[PDB]
Design a protein around this ligand. Structure first.
Ligand code: EQU
Ligand code: EQU
Lengths: 129, 129
């Protein structure tokens, strides 16, 4: 069925673990084949697993990116949820920390149907030498 | 124009301060007149300043509620934002805390057009002596 509030907490938390180790295949596996991703939210969406794979491929590939949950996954009873997290990566040649909040909606199959990542430069922190 | 990312950070943070002191009148003024609220997200929406004011009236009235930002407001460049916060209130006779994530979309006037609060009982913590 549609993931319960507790299942969602578990799914969204796993998601972060997978991004953290850059397991693109396992990441794409969590998505629905016609899922849509907005990241950063505000930018035109990307549709389908293929473009979504391509996104995580270039986003987590080449660079050195880590990500961690920085708080509890908030979860509703309609297969949706929202989490706070921190993405570490090189931004403009310098290591930086990015504060993000992802909102996910899941389908009756436990897969991500909608994904929106709220962040921008105001949330970017460059790590000084 | 549509609030810049930095303006979005200011608006949403101010909103929490307003909720915190129970200023229903200032709160409502932040909302567009035909704004929609889904709180909790998953439940049927309420539309319009009149029903929104009634919602905050009963939500913040009678009870003794507190709210505080527990992390940075994540803001996009297209007039949206999400924030983590902590709401304190009396639940089932006992003081409790609720972990919430609010997502808001503002209109070109800087007023809240759309609001969704993500939380369920899995985000509820009853507080000992
Ligand atoms: C895309 C990115 C790496 C991965 C990533 C970013 C931002 C938000 C994210 C949200 C996610 O749920 C998963 C990965 C990212 C970074 C912003 C700049 C960049 O290097
Ligand atoms: C409504 C409420 C008090 C206020 C409140 C709750 C939940 C989410 C909120 C989100 C807000 O942005 C502002 C206020 C609340 C509580 C749920 C139970 C209750 O006591």
């Amino acid at each position: 069925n549609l993931p319960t509030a507790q299942e969602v907490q578990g799914l969204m938390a796993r998601y972060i673990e997978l991004v953290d180790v850059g397991d693109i295949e396992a990441i794409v596996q969590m998505y629905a084949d016609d899922a849509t991703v907005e990241n950063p939210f505000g930018q035109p969406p990307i549709h389908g697993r293929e473009q979504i794979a391509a996104f995580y491929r270039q986003g987590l590939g080449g660079g050195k990116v880590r990500a961690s949950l920085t708080g509890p996954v908030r979860a509703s009873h309609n297969g949706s949820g929202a989490m706070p997290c921190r993405v570490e990566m090189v931004w403009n040649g310098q290591p930086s920390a990015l504060d993000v909040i992802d909102v996910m909606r899941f389908d009756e199959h436990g897969r991500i149907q909608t994904m929106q990542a709220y962040w921008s430069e105001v949330n970017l922190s460059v790590r000084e030498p």
